[PDB]
Amino acid sequence: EPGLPPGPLENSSAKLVNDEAHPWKPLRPGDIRGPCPGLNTLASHGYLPRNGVATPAQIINAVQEGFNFDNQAAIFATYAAHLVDGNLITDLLSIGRKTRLTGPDPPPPASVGGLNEHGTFEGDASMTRGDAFFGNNHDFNETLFEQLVDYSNRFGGGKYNLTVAGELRFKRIQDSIATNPNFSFVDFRFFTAYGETTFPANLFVDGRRDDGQLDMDAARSFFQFSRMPDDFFRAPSPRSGTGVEVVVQAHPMQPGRNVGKINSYTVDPTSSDFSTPCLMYEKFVNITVKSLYPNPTVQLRKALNTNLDFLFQGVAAGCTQVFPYGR
Numbered sequence: 001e002p003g004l005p006p007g008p009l010e011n012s013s014a015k016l017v018n019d020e021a022h023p024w025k026p027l028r029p030g031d032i033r034g035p036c037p038g039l040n041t042l043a044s045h046g047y048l049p050r051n052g053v054a055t056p057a058q059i060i061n062a063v064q065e066g067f068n069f070d071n072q073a074a075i076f077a078t079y080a081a082h083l084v085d086g087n088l089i090t091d092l093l094s095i096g097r098k099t100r101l102t103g104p105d106p107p108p109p110a111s112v113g114g115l116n117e118h119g120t121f122e123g124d125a126s127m128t129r130g131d132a133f134f135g136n137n138h139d140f141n142e143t144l145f146e147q148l149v150d151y152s153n154r155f156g157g158g159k160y161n162l163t164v165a166g167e168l169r170f171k172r173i174q175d176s177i178a179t180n181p182n183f184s185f186v187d188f189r190f191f192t193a194y195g196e197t198t199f200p201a202n203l204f205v206d207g208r209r210d211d212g213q214l215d216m217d218a219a220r221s222f223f224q225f226s227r228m229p230d231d232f233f234r235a236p237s238p239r240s241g242t243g244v245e246v247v248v249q250a251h252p253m254q255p256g257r258n259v260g261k262i263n264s265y266t267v268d269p270t271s272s273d274f275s276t277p278c279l280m281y282e283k284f285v286n287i288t289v290k291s292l293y294p295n296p297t298v299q300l301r302k303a304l305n306t307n308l309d310f311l312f313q314g315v316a317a318g319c320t321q322v323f324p325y326g327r
């Protein structure tokens with residue numbers, strides 16, 4: 001019932017992806033878009049179902065076909081998101097808000113809240129979306145985008161590149177520390193917050209150039225309108241987070257959180273960090289997934305174990321698989 005994770009592209013060359021079969025269309029009533037401009041764009045070009053509800057296999061195929069996201073990264077992200085935000089029985093995940101379209105819900109404490117669910121996959125210090133504490137963690141924010149433009153002007157000669165990513169990533173962390181008393185920057189979010197800042201440079205840059213310099217017209221088109229530029233070619237090879245080391249090196253940070261007040265950022269020594277990637281995977285499964293499904297019934301336990309096996313396919317070589325519900 002859960003389909004097998006798709007394999008890598010047979011042909012990963014750059015090609016036109018804004019093509020006749022995948023035109024941009026505006027939203028219809030009920031169409032769901034969320035905090036990810038990549039998935040949003042794929043839905044708005046029909047690489048995913050246009051209503052924003054999809055299976056993990058549909059998501060993996062879409063990120064590969066439309067943007068040349070690499071297979072390992074696609075698998076890890078998709079199954080992580082599905083485990084914490086999707087319906088494991090129906091095999092459906094919303095790319096934004098919680099919806100009845102993902103089917104009959106499992107029992108509490110599982111939320112099946114879609115990608116909009118705060119603190120599962122989605123988290124604080126996003127580039128163009130506000131922190132959940134401020135009321136909306138999913139819609140495009142013009143003020144935040146204008147700051148991205150400003151940082152691109154200051155550090156990228158008017159373009160978004162890895163140097164800009166390094167500076168903006170830090171600025172957003174510092175702004176959340178100063179204003180969000182509930183700011184959390186540990187474990188899974190600590191990792192994804194860095195990786196996501198490379199994606200516009202690696203994946204939104206036309207693949208015929210692949211120069212890591214994203215122009216602001218293209219940036220707005222993706223971030224605000226979920227729309228590929230006219231004649232957009234995808235990247236010329238599979239990739240996801242390459243160059244994340246540049247972003248980290250610009251302003252190395254420890255994982256931590258504000259402790260109920262602004263300007264109280266307190267390092268968490270129980271968090272994983274970039275020195276312990278396997279711990280990030282182990283805590284995600286043992287703590288995050290397990291807490292949503294502490295004592296699942298038979299069909300849920302089976303679906304959990306299958307999706308956990310799929311998640312492990314995307315885990316970097318050298319980590320040991322963990323089994324929260326037995327073998």
Ligand code: HEM
Pocket residue numbers: 035036037038039059063067069073074075077078081115121122123124125126127128129192196197199200203204
């Ligand atoms: C493979 C499955 C994917 C999933 C499940 C996924 C999910 C998400 C989620 C939940 C966020 C919000 C994190 C946060 O800021 O709090 C996010 C951010 C982001 N995603 Fe993805 N994503 C995926 C692939 C991609 C791809 C292929 C691209 C580009 C082609 C992309 C581009 C981005 C960008 C740029 C952000 C940051 C948005 C911002 O901070 O303003 N994603 N994604």
Ligand SMILES: *[C@@H]1O[C@H](CO)[C@@H](O)[C@H](O)[C@H]1NC(C)=O
Pocket residue numbers: 011012013014015
């Ligand atoms: C792979 O796709 C590219 C772009 O569409 C094309 O030029 C190339 O010849 C394809 N390779 C094969 C083996 O068909």
Ligand SMILES: *[C@@H]1O[C@H](CO)[C@@H](O)[C@H](O)[C@H]1NC(C)=O
Pocket residue numbers: 118119132133134182184
């Ligand atoms: C506040 O932080 C906790 C995690 O420490 C999280 O469970 C909760 O959803 C957060 N809420 C908002 C609006 O940030």
Ligand SMILES: *[C@@H]1O[C@H](CO)[C@@H](O)[C@H](O)[C@H]1NC(C)=O
Pocket residue numbers: 130141142143144
């Ligand atoms: C956008 O972000 C700014 C800056 O953090 C915030 O003040 C504003 O309330 C957000 N929302 C909108 C709708 O502009």
Ligand SMILES: *[C@@H]1O[C@H](CO)[C@@H](O)[C@H](O)[C@H]1NC(C)=O
Pocket residue numbers: 155156157161162163164212
């Ligand atoms: C970003 O652009 C600026 C200005 O062109 C340049 O100095 C810097 O080296 C660029 N960084 C990257 C990683 O391309």
Ligand SMILES: *[C@@H]1O[C@H](CO)[C@@H](O)[C@H](O)[C@H]1NC(C)=O
Pocket residue numbers: 279282283286322323324
């Ligand atoms: C996760 O649970 C497994 C037992 O299934 C255990 O071996 C492992 O040490 C745990 N890891 C963490 C980080 O809790």
Ligand SMILES: COc1cccc(OC)c1O
Pocket residue numbers: 073077191192193194195196240241
């Ligand atoms: C490969 O890593 C990732 C995959 C999907 C989303 C991410 O950031 C939100 C991310 O950092």
Ligand SMILES: [Cl-]
Pocket residue numbers: 008009069070071072238
């Ligand atoms: Cl790949």
Ligand SMILES: [Mg+2]
Pocket residue numbers: 035122123124125126129130131137
């Ligand atoms: Mg966020």
